[PDB]
Amino acid sequence: RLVKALEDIMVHYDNTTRNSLGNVIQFIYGEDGMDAAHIEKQSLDTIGGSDAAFEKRYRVDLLNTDHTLDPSLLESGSEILGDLKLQVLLDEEYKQLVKDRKFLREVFVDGEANWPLPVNIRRIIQNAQQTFHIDHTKPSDLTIKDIVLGVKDLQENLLVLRGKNEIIQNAQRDAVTLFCCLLRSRLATRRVLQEYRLTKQAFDWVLSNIEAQFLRSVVHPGEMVGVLAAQSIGEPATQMTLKKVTSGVPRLKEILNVAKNMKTPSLTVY
Amino acid sequence: LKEKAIPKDQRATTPYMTKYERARILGTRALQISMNAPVFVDLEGETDPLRIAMKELAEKKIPLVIRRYLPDGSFEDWSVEELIVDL
Amino acid sequence: VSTSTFQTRRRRLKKVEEEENAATLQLGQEFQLKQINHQGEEEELIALNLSEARLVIKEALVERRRAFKRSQKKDFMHSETREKELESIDVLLEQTTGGNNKDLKNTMQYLTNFSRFRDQETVGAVIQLLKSTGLHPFEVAQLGSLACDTADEAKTLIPSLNNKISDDELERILKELSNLETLY
Amino acid sequence: LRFGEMERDCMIAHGAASFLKERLMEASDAFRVHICGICGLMTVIAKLNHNQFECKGCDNKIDIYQIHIPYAAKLLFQELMAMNITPRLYTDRSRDF
Amino acid sequence: AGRAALYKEVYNVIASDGSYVNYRHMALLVDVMTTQGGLTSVTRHGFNRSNTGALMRCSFEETVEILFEAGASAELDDCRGVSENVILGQMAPIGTGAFDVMIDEESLVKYM
Amino acid sequence: MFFIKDLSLNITLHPSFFGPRMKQYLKTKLLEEVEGSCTGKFGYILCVLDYDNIDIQRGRILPTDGSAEFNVKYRAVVFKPFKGEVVDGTVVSCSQHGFEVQVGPMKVFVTKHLMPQDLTFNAGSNPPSYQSSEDVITIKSRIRVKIEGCISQVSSIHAIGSIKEDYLGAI
Amino acid sequence: GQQYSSAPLRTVKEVQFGLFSPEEVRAISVAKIRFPETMDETQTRAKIGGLNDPRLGSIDRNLKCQTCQEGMNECPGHFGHIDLAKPVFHVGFIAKIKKVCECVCMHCGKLLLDEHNELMRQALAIKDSKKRFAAIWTLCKTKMVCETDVPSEDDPTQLVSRGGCGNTQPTIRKDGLKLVGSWDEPELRVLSTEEILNIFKHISVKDFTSLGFNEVFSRPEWMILTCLPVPPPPVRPSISFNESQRGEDDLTFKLADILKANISLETLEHNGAPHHAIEEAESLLQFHVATYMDNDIAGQPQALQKSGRPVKSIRARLKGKEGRIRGNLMGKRVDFSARTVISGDPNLELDQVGVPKSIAKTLTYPEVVTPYNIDRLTQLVRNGPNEHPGAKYVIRDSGDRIDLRYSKRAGDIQLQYGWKVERHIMDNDPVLFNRQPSLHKMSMMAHRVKVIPYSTFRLNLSVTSPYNADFDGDEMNLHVPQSEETRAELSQLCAVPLQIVSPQSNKPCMGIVQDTLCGIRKLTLRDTFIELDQVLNMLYWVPDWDGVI
Ligand SMILES: [Mg+2]
Ligand SMILES: [Zn+2]
Ligand SMILES: [Zn+2]
Ligand SMILES: [Zn+2]
């Protein structure tokens, strides 16, 4: 029933998901336009933890004795201590990170951080580690401008829908969004220089690999998702070997048949 | 009852070749090679037309052109030279 | 296979809808007024006459001979009056045609024997004269390739004029086309 | 061996269309039939040794086509005609979409 | 909110055993049910009533009478349907069949 | 009368010819299928115009054998008779049942029962001819005939005409 | 198939469904059909010019098809016809006609609600035909008396008159194969077919256009049968035996009975017969029509045939599962297939599959003669169809077939370009390997070939999970592609190393199990230690070992 119900549903060439009549089912498949293969369970560090560990982990104030990075983690670390033109950008960064924490505690009310996203970063870092052999005993050669402006210019490239008009633009910004939050979670001007000493070359390399892998992880127009989802649900249903409320196979029969007179009604009032 | 000829500009589709596009290109070309067709690469000792079409792709020396169709009935014409082949 | 035309329609199911041809300006549905041009232009229905068409196929065979010899690797013979044209068409046709097109050989024979002219300028003034009358291209053709010494003769051999032009004014053009004539 | 519906669904999931067309035609059923222009029926009288066709009744010997479909589908249409139902087969669409 | 409670319930069905399925599949299904105006069921009387091709709907359960009323009420078929290209034994506009191919004569000559 | 029509035609092409020679062969095959043909739809195909500029466009590959289908748009000189079309011509064959005036690629026929009563038959001469009170019509004779009937058949068109109407006959 | 025809090959983009007009049926039929006898020119082994081939389809490997001939393996069959003594309902449209006669009054024959009724335009609104008809039927089902004068949009004082005739319409309902209608005490009279036809023919044009009917393809009066289309012999086969035996199909018998009852009903007209005694055979003709199209009626009729057979109707051929659609057109028993018991081999790679020699010599692939391989091809042709890397067929460009186990030029053979060589199956070829049931995208994957002895399909261990197979005798299936683009599809789309990551769960669906999975923990210990002599063989076993101790 499922397979014969969903056959003619596939990602077309504008990442729309329509049927043999062209009526739109989704405007981007999976509400992200992303192929389910290149997706891995990561953990956005912007959500969990106290505000103490948050500021301890992401705040950089060049205008303080204890809130500025040690000039050992950067050559220019001693001749920037007190530079006020850059604290505008550092404050913009920290503001944006806090905005993430609010937005993602708003969408993910569990506070659950482990969630599946494309592009696995916490390996893409170690590839730069063993590939460029950066010892955690020399200072970086990255200006803060390269970090902040670098990531900010990176987000402009992670495309999913190429378009001109305002509509497709907002559709794109909503098509990414959740990824950029992890991107800012792992590319913080502190962790980038404190946790894993990045050079400029390794940094641009990480941006390149991120852009590439991301572009790879997009759905391929033509992919018949209707059949894929149909069998993706029908297969585990067969692997079902069956508080006393309807569950399992018969409940599923009620769901698909859409019956007014279910076995266990019941409701939950908080 | 006319033409939805999408110009070279205002080109919206992905600049990359889908695994399905690539698959049917290597397929069709390999067939044509086996149909005793002119090959546009130095074979360097190759007798399997699939492999030969693969070499034709690596050097982007295939004359084929993909017509990507859109739901409304429009079409973007892309060349196998234009399309980046990542995959 | 099957050659299709530019003015293409689709009368589904209606297997019985075809008008009958007639002399009184009733041509097939493929030969109405400004027929459809493949470029997308309501182009006027094209009609030729004798000799003129011989010139058309003549230029076509000139570009066909020259373009036919441009790729023959790995400045013009013309003039020709009457018989030195009849003999010269043959080799050109057998070089730049499949030869099997016997209809082409017969049609060229008819197009040069009953050819009313020879010069391009003459038939040009003919086209300006008859097309200046504002008549049907079929009429421009017939009056462009018949010899009617009398307005009654022209009105007889063409049941399409009649009340489209007066007899003596119709004579006015015939007295000019009688002069505009290449003597054999 | 049978190539049932589930075996079809899997190949639709892979998106391998030429393999399916191969498996449903040259690999099993397969048939060439002529169709009239007006009536989308199988009225054509194929005189292949004389290049003569005709669709009598509709009176057509100029505009007649051929198509490659599985003989099973041909028999299906002959049965639906055996229940007085005309499935007009048309080669070109007339609805933009 | 109906679609939301539906997806959530189904997710409790699949995740009851602990087996995981990527959001996009289930979400695709529930989207298919809601994207009509209400709850379109997944049965004979459910979705096979829509404007889909006569043969596509024909290949599910009721069949004969669907072709009867399709012949009576002069239905015309889009042929965009998967199952219908399957019946005609043609290249189904499916992934590999979702585009056309041509030979650009210019680039063709510019390899010699 | 002769017409000039816009025509389109689909030609399939084997993968063997997928080279720079391709654009040539197509045209060389079009002239083999189009020129010399005849059908009541658009009369006789005589000559294709402007060989130097004929449009081909790209063609799609039939998705089972590497063949490629092309749609070619062109212009051609055509000709087909009509009822009541007065045209001149010359006889080719003649006997006791009437004479056959040939015009262009088409064989027009005229019946004894259609000629004037003063004109009669003459078989006692080589070649035979129809003798009148003043005129004689044999083979090479010019006659202007008004076409009355038209018949299409396979790859040829025949017709029936008259000389009884005024302003017709030998010219 | 086969024999070129000078016709332009095309595809299908529209499929328009209509209803046959009796004029079309009587304009397409090749023969009139009068004799209800099958073959045997009165005990003469041939065919009577009456049923199955007075002109149409051919049997017994002969020509004769209105000069079409082309034998059996080319002619599609040509359609006949048979007249009717009187009009007869259609078995599936009775439910419709019952609801159409309730929307338009008899006597006159026009709609019961004009545009002055405000709920009528509300039906004429949505262009959906199948729901517009439901609306109109939901409206005029109450009007059981026709109308002529009705107050319009103004006031009930202003009476606007439409078309005349205002007789009472009955409360019609279906009984068996006929309709019932009651018009103080109501009255009853038979609603014969001739009335329904004679009244539907006078329905107005916009009424056709408003009840979902078509002007040229599907009119309501074509729901009533006037002439029956005789199917050609291919629809009703004659599976016989020996030479002097029969074996016609059930459809031939039902059609025969239809012809019998039709001859009886038509002879009862030129001869003396009462009104309510002819109709006893009229409902018999209508009956044989009904059971000929639908013999699984929900009503009392069941209609067997002599031998206790319930008669396979036409709808019984088409309804799904082992039927025309779900059993043939959506799933066939294709050629170039093989199935057998399987066993796991820990010395193969993932994508490989161990095919036995017999299958390798039995399954074939059509290669083309090309300069790149003509030495190989000729070598194979000369190895013959019994030494493993051989071939078994050669096809010329003239469409001729050349067997290799028979023939006399079995060792000669001058292969020319463009010819075809049906070779055997060799290693590293792309095949489609699967296990039923195919409830999974992963259930059919492409495999590289390796030819081996013994009669077992041999497959790698770590590929049991996406196939879900055990070695207690489970049989596996295998298909072989047939074009170059097809095997390209299999190799660049359906390859096993491609389908390691499952999109259904964003996770690899191919682990390491059992003997591999057990000992690998035993090996991965601080207590596990190997000494030299074994270590070297361990290293050599790694095929991609860099040769570094
Ligand atoms: Mg078992
Ligand atoms: Zn027809
Ligand atoms: Zn036949
Ligand atoms: Zn009435």
Give the Cα separation of F126 and F94 in Å (integer): 11
Residue D10 assigned as binding residue: no
Structure tokens at G148: 């002529």
Smallest CA-to-CA distance from G266 within G293, G285, G291 is with: G285
Structure tokens at D97: 């979409």
Give the Cα separation of E107 and E104 in Å (integer): 6
Q: Which CATH number fits domain B1-87: 2.40.50.140, 3.90.940.10, 3.30.70.380, 3.40.50.720?
A: 3.90.940.10
User: In Å, what resolution does this model reach?
Assistant: 3.8
Smallest CA-to-CA distance from F167 within G344, C116, D46, C154 is with: C154
Of the residues F59, F82, F105, the one at which a domain ends: F82
Give the Cα separation of G148 and G110 in Å (integer): 11
By the 8 A CB rule, do G359 and G353 touch?
A: no
Residue with tokens 């016709």: G7
Give the Cα separation of G417 and B35 in Å (integer): 10
DSSP letter at G263?
H
* Radius of gyration of chain E measured on its C-alpha atoms: 21
By the 8 A CB rule, do G249 and G237 touch?
A: yes
Contact D92 C12 (CB under 8 A): no
Which ligand has the nearest atom to the CA of G474? 1
CATH code for the domain of F89: 2.40.50.140
Give the Cα separation of A20 and G343 in Å (integer): 43
By the 8 A CB rule, do G59 and G252 touch?
A: no
Asked if A touches F (at least 3 Cβ pairs < 8 angstroms), the answer reads no
Give the Cα separation of A233 and A242 in Å (integer): 17
Residue F150 belongs to what domain range? 83-171
Together in a domain, F7 and F53 = yes
Give the Cα separation of B56 and B31 in Å (integer): 13
DSSP letter at G325?
I
D86 DSSP β-pair partners: G18
Together in a domain, F171 and F89 = yes
Contact E67 D80 (CB under 8 A): yes
Question: How many other CB atoms are found less than 10 A from the CB of residue G306?
Answer: 7
CB neighbour class for G165 (10 Å; exposed up to 12, middle 13-18, buried from 19): middle
SS3 assignment for D47-87: ECCCCECCCCCCCCCCCEEEEECCHHHHHHHHHHHHCCCEE
Would you mind telling me the total number of residues written for chain B in this entry? 87
Contact D96 B24 (CB under 8 A): no
Cα–ligand 3 centroid distance for G255 (angstroms): 21
Give the Cα separation of G320 and G325 in Å (integer): 6
Mutate to test the interface with F, among D24, D62, D91, D92 (most CBs of F within 10 A): D62
Check CB contact of D62 with chain C, cutoff 8 Å: yes
Together in a domain, F69 and F4 = yes
Cα A174 from chain centre: 12
Give the Cα separation of E21 and E15 in Å (integer): 8
Give the Cα separation of F121 and F131 in Å (integer): 6
- Nearest by CB to residue A255, choosing from E9, E35, E82, is E9
D52 DSSP β-pair partners: D47
- Shortest alpha-carbon distance between residue E112 and chain D (Å): 31
For residue B30, what are the contacts with CB-CB under 8 A and spacing of at least 6?
Answer: B49, B50, B52, B53, G484, G485, G488
Contact G504 A228 (CB under 8 A): yes
Question: How many other CB atoms are found less than 10 A from the CB of residue A14?
Answer: 21
Smallest CA-to-CA distance from G457 within G341, G337, G361, G338 is with: G341
b/e burial code for range F131-158 (CB count within 10 A of at least 16 → b): bbeeeebbeebebbbbbbebeeeeeebe
Question: How many other CB atoms are found less than 10 A from the CB of residue D40?
Answer: 23
Cα–ligand 1 centroid distance for G475 (angstroms): 9
| Domain spans, chain C | 1-47, 48-72+81-184
Question: How many other CB atoms are found less than 10 A from the CB of residue G202?
Answer: 14
Give the Cα separation of B52 and B29 in Å (integer): 9
Cα–ligand 2 centroid distance for G87 (angstroms): 26
Give the Cα separation of G231 and F161 in Å (integer): 48
Mutate to test the interface with B, among E78, E94, E109, E111 (most CBs of B within 10 A): E111
* Radius of gyration of chain A measured on its C-alpha atoms: 23
By the 8 A CB rule, do G104 and G110 touch?
A: yes
DSSP letter at A83?
-
Give the Cα separation of G292 and G317 in Å (integer): 12
A195 DSSP β-pair partners: none
CB neighbour class for A131 (10 Å; exposed up to 12, middle 13-18, buried from 19): exposed
Q: Give the HSE-up count for residue G32: Cα atoms under 13 Å, Cβ half-sphere.
A: 3
By the 8 A CB rule, do G500 and G441 touch?
A: no
Q: Where are the alpha helices (DSSP H) in G201-320?
A: 205-210, 250-270, 275-293, 315-318
Q: What is the tally of structural domains in chain F?
A: 2
Looking at beta carbons, which residues of chain A come within 8 Å of E21? 232-233, 236
Structure tokens at D31: 């048939």
Which residues of G fall in the annotated binding site for Zn(2+)? Answer: 65, 68, 75, 78, 105, 108, 146, 165
For residue C31, what are the contacts with CB-CB under 8 A and spacing of at least 6?
Answer: C45, F3
Of the residues F82, F111, F141, the one at which a domain ends: F82
By the 8 A CB rule, do A41 and E20 touch?
A: no
Cα–ligand 4 centroid distance for G148 (angstroms): 8
Together in a domain, F158 and F147 = yes
Q: How far is CA A99 from CA A42, A105, A184, F155, in A?
A: 20, 10, 11, 81
Looking at beta carbons, which residues of chain A come within 8 Å of D13? 224, 227-228, 231
CB neighbour class for C75 (10 Å; exposed up to 12, middle 13-18, buried from 19): exposed
Check CB contact of A231 with chain G, cutoff 8 Å: yes
Q: How far is CA A113 from CA A38, A40, A44, A49, A110, in A?
A: 19, 13, 5, 10, 9
Q: How far is CA F126 from CA A175, F122, F130, G443, in A?
A: 95, 10, 12, 89
CATH code for the domain of F54: 3.30.1490.120
Residues of B with CB under 8 A from a CB of D: 1, 20, 23-24, 27, 72-73
By the 8 A CB rule, do G477 and D1 touch?
A: yes
Check CB contact of G110 with chain B, cutoff 8 Å: no
Cα–ligand 2 centroid distance for E63 (angstroms): 28
- Shortest alpha-carbon distance between residue A223 and chain B (Å): 8
DSSP letter at G436?
S
Instruction: Return the axis-axis angle of helices C83-95 and C52-70, rounded to nearest 10°.
Output: 40
Together in a domain, F32 and F109 = no
G230 DSSP β-pair partners: G80
Fold observed for domain C48-72+81-184? Growth Hormone; Chain: A; (1.20.1250)
Mutate to test the interface with G, among E75, E78, E79, E90 (most CBs of G within 10 A): E75
For residue D58, what are the contacts with CB-CB under 8 A and spacing of at least 6?
Answer: C15, D36, D37, D38, D39, D43
Of the residues F82, F113, F136, the one at which a domain ends: F82
- Shortest alpha-carbon distance between residue E88 and chain D (Å): 5
G434 DSSP β-pair partners: G444, G477
Give the Cα separation of F98 and F94 in Å (integer): 6
Give the Cα separation of G259 and F164 in Å (integer): 59
By the 8 A CB rule, do A14 and A33 touch?
A: no
CB neighbour class for A146 (10 Å; exposed up to 12, middle 13-18, buried from 19): middle
Contact E89 D69 (CB under 8 A): yes
* Radius of gyration of chain D measured on its C-alpha atoms: 16
Cα G241 from chain centre: 28
b/e burial code for range G436-468 (CB count within 10 A of at least 16 → b): bebbbbbbbbbbbbbbbeeebbbbbbbbbebbb
Sign of the torsion formed by the C-alpha atoms of G420, G422, G423 and G427: positive
Cα–ligand 4 centroid distance for G160 (angstroms): 16
Give the Cα separation of G189 and G61 in Å (integer): 54
Q: Which residue of G has its CA nearest to E22?
A: G505
Q: What stretch of H or E contains C54?
A: helix C52-70
Cα–ligand 4 centroid distance for C61 (angstroms): 73
Cα B46 from chain centre: 21
SS3 assignment for G368-400: ECCCCCHHHHHHHHHHCCCCCCCEEEEECCCCC
Q: What would the DSSP string read from start to end of F116-140?
A: -TT-EEE-SSSS-EEE-SS-EE-SS
For residue A240, what are the contacts with CB-CB under 8 A and spacing of at least 6?
Answer: A248, A249, E17
Give the Cα separation of A189 and F65 in Å (integer): 59
By the 8 A CB rule, do F49 and F76 touch?
A: yes
Smallest CA-to-CA distance from E92 within D19, F19, G348, F164 is with: D19
Together in a domain, F163 and F144 = yes
Q: What would the DSSP string read from start to end of A155-168?
A: HTT--SS---SHHH
For residue E85, what are the contacts with CB-CB under 8 A and spacing of at least 6?
Answer: E79, E91, E92, E93
Give the Cα separation of G434 and A51 in Å (integer): 55
| Long-range contacts, stretch A99-103, CB < 8 angstroms, 24+ apart | A100/A46, A100/A181, A100/A184, A100/A185, A101/A46, A101/A47, A101/A54, A103/A181
Looking at beta carbons, which residues of chain C come within 8 Å of D38? 12-15
Q: What stretch of H or E contains F46?
A: strand F43-48
By the 8 A CB rule, do G57 and G234 touch?
A: yes
Together in a domain, F75 and F107 = no
Smallest CA-to-CA distance from G313 within G294, G327, G297, G298 is with: G294
Torsion angle, alpha carbons of C37, C39, C40, C43, to 10: -30
| Long-range contacts, stretch G45-53, CB < 8 angstroms, 24+ apart | G45/G244, G51/G230, G51/G252, G51/G255, G51/G256, G51/G259, G52/G233, G52/G236, G52/G238, G52/G252, G53/G233
By the 8 A CB rule, do E30 and A124 touch?
A: no
For residue C94, what are the contacts with CB-CB under 8 A and spacing of at least 6?
Answer: none
Structure tokens at G334: 């294709």
- Shortest alpha-carbon distance between residue A223 and chain D (Å): 7
Q: Give the HSE-up count for residue G215: Cα atoms under 13 Å, Cβ half-sphere.
A: 7
